[PDB]
Amino acid sequence: TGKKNLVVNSVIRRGKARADGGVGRKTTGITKRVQRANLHKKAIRENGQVKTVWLSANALRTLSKGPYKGIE
Amino acid sequence: PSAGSHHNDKLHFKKGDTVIVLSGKHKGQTGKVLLALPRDQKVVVEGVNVITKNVKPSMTNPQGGQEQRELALHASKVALVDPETGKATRVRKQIVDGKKVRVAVASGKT
Amino acid sequence: MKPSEMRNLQATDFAKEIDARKKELMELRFQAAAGQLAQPHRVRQLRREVAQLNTVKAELARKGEQ
Amino acid sequence: SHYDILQAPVISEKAYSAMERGVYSFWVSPKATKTEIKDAIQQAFGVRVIGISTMNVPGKRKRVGRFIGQRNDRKKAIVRLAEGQSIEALAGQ
RNA sequence: CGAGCUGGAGAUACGCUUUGACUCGGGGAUGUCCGAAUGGGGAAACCCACCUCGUAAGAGGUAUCCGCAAGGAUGGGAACUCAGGGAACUGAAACAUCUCAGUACCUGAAGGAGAAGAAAGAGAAUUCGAUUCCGUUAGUAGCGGCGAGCGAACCCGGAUCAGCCCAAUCAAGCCGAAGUGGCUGGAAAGCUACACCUCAGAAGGUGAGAGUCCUGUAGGCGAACGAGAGGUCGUUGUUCGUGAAACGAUGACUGAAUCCGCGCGGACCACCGCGCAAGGCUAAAUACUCCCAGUGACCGAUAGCGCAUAGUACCGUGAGGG
RNA sequence: GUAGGGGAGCGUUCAGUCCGCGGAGAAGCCAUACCGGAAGGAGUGGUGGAGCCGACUGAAGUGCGGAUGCCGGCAUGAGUAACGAUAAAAGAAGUGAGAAUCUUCUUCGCCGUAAGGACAAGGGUUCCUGGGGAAGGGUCGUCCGCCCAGGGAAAGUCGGGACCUAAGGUGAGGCCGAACGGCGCAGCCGAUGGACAGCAGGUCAAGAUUCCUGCACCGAUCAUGUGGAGUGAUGGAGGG
Known part of the structure; x- marks a missing residue:
């Protein structure tokens, strides 16, 4: 989970073969199709007073700059 | 087991009135009610x-x-009677006991 | 027994009107299990009474302060 | 009050036999700790209590009826007055 | 309400009642111990403490989270709603694709209903103009090991129909018309002979088949007081399984403008055209059904619910079954 | 004439309609040498004790011998095999409607590191007394661990709790996590372990280091005297 917005939870991952032919080979057969999840990280921050909490790149970046309710 | 509600736990008479027993045996026989x-x-x-x-x-x-x-x-048994015969009931009102109401048939007593 | 001639009494008298009925109620109950309870009803009454004995007293609990 | 809690007197023969020696015993209430009970009694019969014994008693009966039965749980308690023998006369019974 | 009551049970004793019980409507007060349970402990209903009020008895407070502060939250709900997670069998007469399905199941949140909602839309007539639901369009367009098979939307008809705001009568209940004789019988409401009522001849009960005996019905009354952004990579949704495949959506990286501005109209460009996203709340029609009433070319006891009642006996360590 | 196709009908229930039927007696049941081409129908008699035929039409949980079918009843096997350790019994007496099978007495035999006693767990009232006699007791039963009713269980010191901790369980702040949730210091719960004040007798039909009797011990609170001064922690050590 991040500061601004939650995260994690992701989606499936395919894997095709015969991949790419004359502008188009015969086609792209699939052989995978499963399922996955994507995470991030943290750095200590705080508002009101001292904290720590997780901080998502795409937030520690947005916070590194203009702060929004939260201070780096 | 259902039971005696078909009517409506309402006795059309008092455990003190007099009544003639129509239908069944003891037809026309009468006597003061006792158990209500x-x-x-x-x-x-x-x-x-x-x-x-x-x-x-x-x-x-x-x-x-x-x-x-x-x-x-x-x-x-058809509750109460005055003409000496089974008699419905209908023309109520009150007495010097407006605190109550009566009953009556062709005539008007009870 | 409930009419004003009930409330008509004090707060302690109320108590007095209670702690005694269950002093009767007891000897009664004793009698019972001791054999001789000829006054089954008496029990009920006695009981009944103490209910009101409080029921009423509770009625004051909102009448005189709200 | 005082008069509360005691539930009834223990009839039986022994009990009654125990009485001929100044030991009284009635059924008190289940949850009726020794002290309270020791209290009650005294002040309901005017007298003190030198010793007190108490312990619980289940019940589970019936006559018939696919209704088995059910306990009824009691708590016969026994007290020993001081040389100041007797409780009223609800003893001489 | 008006003269019985004293629960199922029916049995005896004591009694209570017109100084209006009983019973029925509707507010109160009592409401032990457990259970969110929450003074602490705990193998549920048990064990132990503390502060305060207090003549003893006895009363009250003592959990955690938001909040100055009131005040709110923790649990429980048959199905219905959305959300996070999400199978296999099965089909493809084998199977990896796909199908079965985003169903079954798990969890979260919630209400009586939800969800969705006021156009960076759909869509082509330079039209319609929130959302939802029904019919239809149409099994058409399309997707598809282009196999098995899956399958829209616009238009049109109908239910209901609002957009507004930010930030710079039903329950209790009371009244209610109109028949006698003879006959068959163990008993008549049946037969029969003359009689009446009928805005009440719906129904149930009466020792057999009842308009006129009872309870009722049509119809009338009826209460203190109670309700009503763009992109690159990984992927995905919509008919969309990479295909030339847009747009939406997002984990990751990046990263704009602002009217001679911005987005889109299935790559893509110009032209023409529709709309203005990154703030929000919102009846109504919709779904279900624990409960209630009425009905039923529904059952009538191996049927019907598992139960003419019982989730009981009984089986299991238990989940559970019954 | 088998699979299969085609035709016409019989019967059950429910439903709308017509004619009706019934307590001097309906449905169902039971009997029968009638009728019809079959499915089937009728008459008469018996039982029965209240709803019910026939006709047209509509709808159907609509027709059965089979599924090692399902539920239930009842058979065969057959007064068969069994009566659950080869520790044996006999007599007298008694009670009783009735006893090999109950009670009494006198002998016999079997266990005796047990087939005796005392706990724990676990089960509950199965304990004791008076009754009982259906069903249970592999037979009898006058009896019972079975049915009924009543009584019975007594603790400052025995076990446990108001003390302790182990494993392990839980756990404010804390560490992780799609949800649910997963871990985690202190603190807490947790014996099976530590700690800790009685013992000798008597005795209900039925209780006993609990009641009684004799004598004793522990803590707690207050009174009195003695004293004549510190007492001494959620911290230290020692120790357990």
């Missing part, structure tokens, strides 16, 4: 009677014989 059992539609008018034999086992010197006693009835 509404729920069940039970009536004890000095009319019907049976001589029962009491079951008094180790009941202090048994000597149990055959008691004459009244047997209850249902809506089988």
Whole structure:
């Protein structure tokens, strides 16, 4: 989970073969199709007073700059 | 087991009035009501009677014989009468006891 | 028994009107299990009474302060 | 009050026999700790209590009826007055 | 309400009642111990403490989270709603694709209903103009190991129909018309002979088949007081399984403008055209059904619910079955 | 004439309609040498004790011998095999409607590191007394661990709790996590372990280091005297 917005939870991952032919080979057969999840990280921050909490790149970046309710 | 509600636990009469027993045996026979059992539609008018034999086992010197006693009835007796014959009821009002209401048929008493 | 001639009494008298009925009620109950309870009903009454004995007293609990 | 809690007197023969020696015993209430009970009694019969014994008693009966039965749980308690023998006369019974 | 009551049970004793019980409507007060349970402990209903009020008895407070502060939250709900997670069998007469399905199941949140909602839309007539639901369009367009098979939307008809705001009568209940004789019978409401009522001849009960005996019905009354952004990579949704495949959506990286501005109209460009996203709340029609009433070319006891009642006996360590 | 196709009908229930039927007696049941081409129908008699035929039409949980079918009843096997350790019994007496099978007495035999006694767990009232006699007791039963009713269980010191901790369980702040949730210091719960004040007798039909009797011990609170001064922690050590 991040500061601004939650995260994690992701989606499936395919894997095709015969991949790419004359502008188009015969086609792209699939052989995978499963399922996955994507995470991030943290750095200590705080508002009101001292904290720590997780901080998502795409937030520690947005916070590194203009702060929004939260201070780096 | 349903029971005596078909009517409506309402006795069309008092455990004190006088009534003639229409239909069934004891037709036209009358007598002062005694038991007013509404729920069940039970009536004890000095009319019907049976001589029962009491079951008094180790009941202090048994000597149990055959008691004459009244047997209850249902809506089988048409409540109260004045013309000396079964009579509906209808023209109520009140008395010097406006705190109440009466009943009456062709005539008007009870 | 409930009419004003009930409330008509004090707060302690109320108590007095209670702690005694269950002093009767007791001897009664004793009698019972001791054999001789000829006054089954008496019990009920006695009981009944103490209910009101409080029921009423509770009625004051909102009447005189709200 | 005082008169509360005691539930009834213990009839039986022994008990009654125990009485001929100044030991009284009635059924108190289940949850009726020794002290309270020791109290009650005294002040309901005017007298003190030198000793007190108490312990619980289940019940589970019936006559018939696919209704088995059910306990009824009691708590017969026994007290020993001081040389100041007797409780009223609800003893001489 | 008006003269019985004293629960199922029916049995006896004591009694209570017109100084209006009983019973029925509707507010109160009592409401032990457990259970969110929450003074602490705990193998549920048990064990132990503390502060305060207090003549003893006895009363009250003592959990955690938001909040100055009131005040709110923790649990429980048959199905219905959305959300996070999400199978296999099965089909493809084998199977990896796909199908079965985003169903079954798990969890979260919630209400009586939800959800969705006021156009960076759909869509082509330079039209319609929130959302939802029904019919239809149409099994058409399309997707598809282009196999098995899956399958829209616009238009049109109908239910219901609002957009507004930010930030710079039903329950209790009371009244209610109109028949007698003879006959068959153990008993008649049946037969029969003359009689009446009928805005009430719906129904149930009466010792057999009942308009006129009872309870009722049509119809009338009826209460203190109670309700009503763009992109690159990984992927995905919509008919969309990479295909030339847009747009939406997002984990990751990046990263704009602002009217001679911005987005889109299935790559893509110009032209023409529709709309203005990154703030929000919102009846109504919709779904279900624990409960209630009425009905039923529904059952009538091996049926019907598992139960004419019982989730009981009984089986299991238990989940559970019954 | 088998699979299969085609035709016409019989019967059950429910439903709308017509004619009706019934307590001097309906449905169902039971009997029968009638009728019809079959499915089937009728008459008469018996039982029965209240709803019910026939006709047209509509709808159907609509027709059965089979599924090692399902529920239930009842058979065969057959007064068969069994009566659950080869520790044996006999007599007298008694009670009783009735006893090989109950009680009494006198002998016999079997266990005797047990087939005796005392706990724990576990089960509950199965304990004791008076009754009972259906069903249970592999037979009898006058009896019972079975049915009924009543009584019975007594603790400052025995076990446990108001003390302790182990494993392990839980756990404010804390560490992780799609949800649910997963871990985690202190603190807490947790014996099976530590700690800790009685013992000798008597005795209900039925209780006992609990009641009684004799004598004793522990803590707690207050009174009195003695004293004549510190007392001494959620911390230290020692120790357990």
